[model samples]
Target chain A: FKFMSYMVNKAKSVNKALEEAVPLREPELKIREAMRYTLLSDGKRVRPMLCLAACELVGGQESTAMSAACAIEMLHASSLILDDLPCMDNDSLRRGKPTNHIVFGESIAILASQALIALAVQKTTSSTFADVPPERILKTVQEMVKAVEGLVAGAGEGMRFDSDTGLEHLEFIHTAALLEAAAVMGAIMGGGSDEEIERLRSYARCIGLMFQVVDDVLDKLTYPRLMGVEKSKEYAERLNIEAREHLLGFDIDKVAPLVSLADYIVNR
Target chain B: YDFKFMSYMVNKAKSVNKALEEAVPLREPELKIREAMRYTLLSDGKRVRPMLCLAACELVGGQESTAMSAACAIEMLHASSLILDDLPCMDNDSLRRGKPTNHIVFGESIAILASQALIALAVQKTTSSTFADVPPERILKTVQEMVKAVEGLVAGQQADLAGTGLEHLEFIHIHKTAALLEAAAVMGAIMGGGSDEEIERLRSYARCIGLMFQVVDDVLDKLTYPRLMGVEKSKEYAERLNIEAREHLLGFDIDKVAPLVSLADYIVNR
Candidate 1:
């Protein structure tokens, strides 16, 4: 219950931060509207919450992580906008709303995604905050760029997905890109020690794969189809356990949010 | 004067091309998009913006190496803007700088993604490049300037797409062309440790030449300003801008400002 409340409070903060991040202003109303439409919609702020939770776990203030948290959400929203294009997933529904292109047309959707990326990179690097060193901020920007590249590579791979696509391929698209980026940025912004960063990275990797496996289970597609229902659930369970193992070095009370997040991924 | 200007330009263009070549090497996984980026980036051009950056840096007694990364970054930003401008949904030009546009060779999707990737890489170059002598705050400031330029570029492109009359065309040109040029000079001045007065002077100089460059382009293409106000009037406007641009450099050493003065003349005469 405590964990749930923590997540709820974090979600509210992240939502407000995200609302202010992409302001609706002049001339480019169509693109701005498209960006705000997708970004402001109701969806679980999972990436930003994970980022903030990981930062808090590493003894960093949530205020220090706020810009990066918002950046992660912007990048995620941009990716979703691109992912739902007719050339890509072609899905009409997202977060129970019509996709960006369905509302704004294809060109504006693409431009909005580009604008979001520019804002993401700009916000993460240029926003003034005294909590983190400039070098760490640069590192955070590089990580975001690498993650966006990872998303592009994943989307490129996704275009070629077929029945023959293997588990390794699925894992590549699901985790190493955005999810790992979120955790790494969190740790970097929080001033984690090298060892702490590595441990958190490991924890994020496991949870990322676990999240995907559980998603496949719920969707009744992908892994469940390829590996059978029993094996899929077992794989998800193993990943959840491994994810929690990385947190053993930290204080149990401090890591409560992350620990419960891992459990929630499996149970929900 | 002509011989001195030609030699200076040849030297700068050679250095700028080498830096650009080094900036965008063929890499893995995203090789296709990288190739597209390189195709538009390395295409034939005057390398004017980077030359302006290097010249502005030198005018303030800064090292070429200190300004090299920013020079490359401005060029990348310019290349990306051109790629975006040539897209089917944008200007739809099939030919650019005498070659088939990026979308012609690489499809619209890859062209768009490659342009975006270039913009990211431009920011990366500006922020991550090593400057042993320059302070971190200065680089941070430079990054801020570049980001503002990009926002201006986007806004200007949006205005252009919406189509405006002659009254608003200068506003569009100011944002689309002058913003980046202004940033180039400002960044150069910042990195070179120029005084605030010097930085503001170069900024004014850059803005004048920036608009002059576009006006000359219009005259050459017989479009926009040239169409609205006959070619003769457009030429007169560009010449006036060139003179105003040169006047900004008068406070500096005449020899040191020679390159910039000649650059203004070249914009009008080219």
Candidate 2:
């Protein structure tokens, strides 16, 4: 109950920030409307929560990390928009709502996705947080750019999913790409030491893979296709354990949210 | 003097071409989209935006190298806009720069993604590329300026798509065309560490050239202002704008401002 409530509250905060992040004005009303349709839609807010949780774990203020958190969500939203395009997943529905192209047609959907990427970079680079040093903010921007590059690579790999790609290669494409970037961005924004950042990166990698494994188990796809449902579940559990081990050196109280998140990933 | 201006443009175009090649590479997995981006970007346009950026920087006494990244960035952005504008839902043009459109060669999907990638690369290049003695704050301001220009351009494109009257057409061109030119000059001036007065003057100069560029196109295409105001009047308007643009450069050294003056005249006379 406590974990659920924490998730709910954090998601609420992220939603509010995202709402305030984009403005719906004329001239580009359709594009902005398309952006808002997906961006403000219901999602777990997992990335933003992970960012905020990691920042707080490093004894950083949430306010200082909020913009970066929103930036991550915006990028995620943009990726989803592209991922759901006709040439991509071709899925008409996402999260029980029509995909961006379905709502705004292909042209505006694509343009809006590009606009969201610009907005993400602009928000991160131009955001004013007196508490954070300029260097750290720049590092965050670099991290986001790195993640976007990964996203493009991942999308390209996804187009070739039928190829005889190895499990490790697919893992890197689906999980380590964006999640590692997200975790590192959070740690960087929080002013974590190099060691601390590396630890969070490892933690993110483990759980990111685990999240996919569980999803495979649920959907009977990917890992489940290779290893069967029972084996995939066991792999997810093993990943959850490895994810928690990375946080062993941190204060237990400070890392409780991450610990809970790891458990929730496999159990949910 | 004409030979000198032509040489200057050639040198700037060569440098911009090299930088643009480096900006978008043919990497694995994303090769198709990157290729589409390169096809449009490396197309044999006049490279006017980058030249404008470099000229503005040099006029403000800044190193050309310091503004190279920004110059490439504006061109990438300009290419992205052209790609979006050429989509079937937009103008549906099949030809650009005397070649097949991006969507004609690569499918519409790849064309769109390639354009999006270019936009991201534009922002990334401006932020990550080394600029001599440039501060983070100035780069931040440059990013904001680029964003404002992109937003304005998108807005103008949307309005143009919805159809507009003469007044709205001017509004569309001002936002769609002038905003980016203004950003290019302002970014060059800022990177060059120009004073506020110099930056503002370059901005006004860019605005005039921007409108003049579109008006000249209108005259040639027999569309928009030319259709409404007629070719002679459009040419006259462009001439006045050229004069105004030159007037803004009066405060700078004649030797330094010669390229910009030539550029203004080239817009009308070309």
Candidate 3:
């Protein structure tokens, strides 16, 4: 549990650094302004922690994952902006603040998403990763492309489900596929080996499903104290079991912190 | 292929245009912005800048594949410039390529977002080539060129919209029309494996033809449509562009790029 706290604190700084590094350049003023609108709206840094943990677990240094951590955060930021657009979720609230489209107008919000993606790629490629072997860096870039591809697939699936389904399927319809993609990509950037990557994918799949399930449970019983505590404990137990199973092939003692972290998310 | 022959030149242009049409539809996205991009981008015109890029790539020692993305980027930028130019604050023209403009079909806001997305997509695609085996340095350089080209075009568009249409015509025309094509020509040479000196020569060629192309368009608009109040004065203006275009390419081998010179000549003489 203490280890999980350490990891979470470290993630906060990385997310903060990424927030500061977002370039608010001229010539795309409105777009940049709208991008900052959502990016600065606070959120947990779960993505970067996964990335840093993946890097550390795979015997890579923290520096190797820093830029990638930043890149993933920006990509996540950009995705949220696009997701909140009129054509997509069309929501007025994101992170408890007015969505980008609500404040900046839809046109600027749309441009802002595109511009942020471009800038994210620019920052990703221009970083120290460029000095690494071309094949490794290229793999990293292709991972980014695949993440976006996965997102489009998820979005398309969501829309398809929305047109023909009830709210009971919200877990599958909303965040399951996207959260998996985000976690898997974060794991890859963290420098996991092929086997470890697959394992991390398995872990992410389980937790992602559990995360959505908990979200559903919360939506139904937001203020039911006993029910909330019991549901959270059950969610934490499921995540712990799945996370531990995923880590079985690795050094289980060393990866106990990741399991603890999964437990922490559920209990919170 | 007889590079000097007019038929062969037109055939080359046709081939390049065909490649561009094929490439533009390859990047499919489910987003409406992507759909809007395809809707506006696939519209037809001369395909002049793409042709120039492909031709320059062929002229230098490089292969066509190396320059295709660059050509596409240049065309996308050109398309974006035209889309923005047709905005309400700008030219407000309803027709382009004889069809209703993007803003007419998609509305002003979508049109603007689509244009901006196209620019970002151009820069993104230029930097991340799936097929072209160009060096990263070259790709970065080409993207830098694109950034400058877009900046100049945007600034030009800003100037154009800030006042009466004809009042800031030179800066608008130079930046909006000329700089992008001019950059295209230089990027062609860059992708074509041209030496520094050769690139400089091609740039000079581009600058001359770029302005000449715009002045010719102005002259044609004056002679045929006569939209603005200055129909009779266009001939002298066209002649001035022609002379200036020719003067910039003074020391080059006249026979090697004679078609470019002839292009300028036909603009005024025809």
Q: Against the true structure, whose DockQ is highest?
A: 2
lDDT of 3 by residue, A1-268 (tens): 5665686687777857676766567754555566677766667766666666666666665667667666666678877776776556668886757888788766456545655665565555543642554444445544554465455545225323454455434322233443444455555555657787778777877776666556655653242363475776575566768777887776654576567667765675
**How many clashes in each candidate?**
0, 0, 0
lDDT of 2 by residue, A1-268 (tens): 6898989999998899889889778746778888899899888989988988888888786777788888888889888887897767788997846888888887777678777877887787766775577756767887777777666655234332434545333432433556777687788888898898889989998998898888767762367667678788888898888998899778777988999999988986
lDDT, residue B220, model 2:
85
Better of 2 and 3 by DockQ: 2
For model 1, residues A1-268, the per-residue Cα lDDT tens digits are: 7777878898999999888877777766777888899988888788888888778888887878788888888889988887787656778887747898888777677778877877787788765575467867877877777777666666234433355645334433333567777787888888888788778889988998888788888962378777777899999999988998898788777987888899988997
Shift in Å, residue A114, candidate 2: 3.1
Structure candidate 2, residue pairs in collision: none
- What DockQ would you assign to candidate 2? 0.40
- For model 3 the local lDDT of residue B235 reads 57
lDDT of 2: 0.82
Where model 2 places Cα greater than 4 Å from the true spot, the runs are A155-176, B163-165, B221-223
Candidates in descending TM-score order: 2, 1, 3
* Share of reference contacts kept by candidate 1: 0.20
DockQ each? 0.38, 0.40, 0.12
Model 3, stretches more than 4 Å misplaced?
A1-12, A23-31, A48-57, A127-130, A153-213, A220-265, B1-10, B13-39, B73-137, B143-183, B195-219, B222-270
lDDT of 2 by residue, B4-24 (tens): 788889988999999898787
Task: Give the TM-score (vs. native) of candidate 3.
Answer: 0.67
* Model 1 regions lying over 4 Å from their true place: A155-176, B163-166, B221-223
lDDT of each: 0.81, 0.82, 0.64
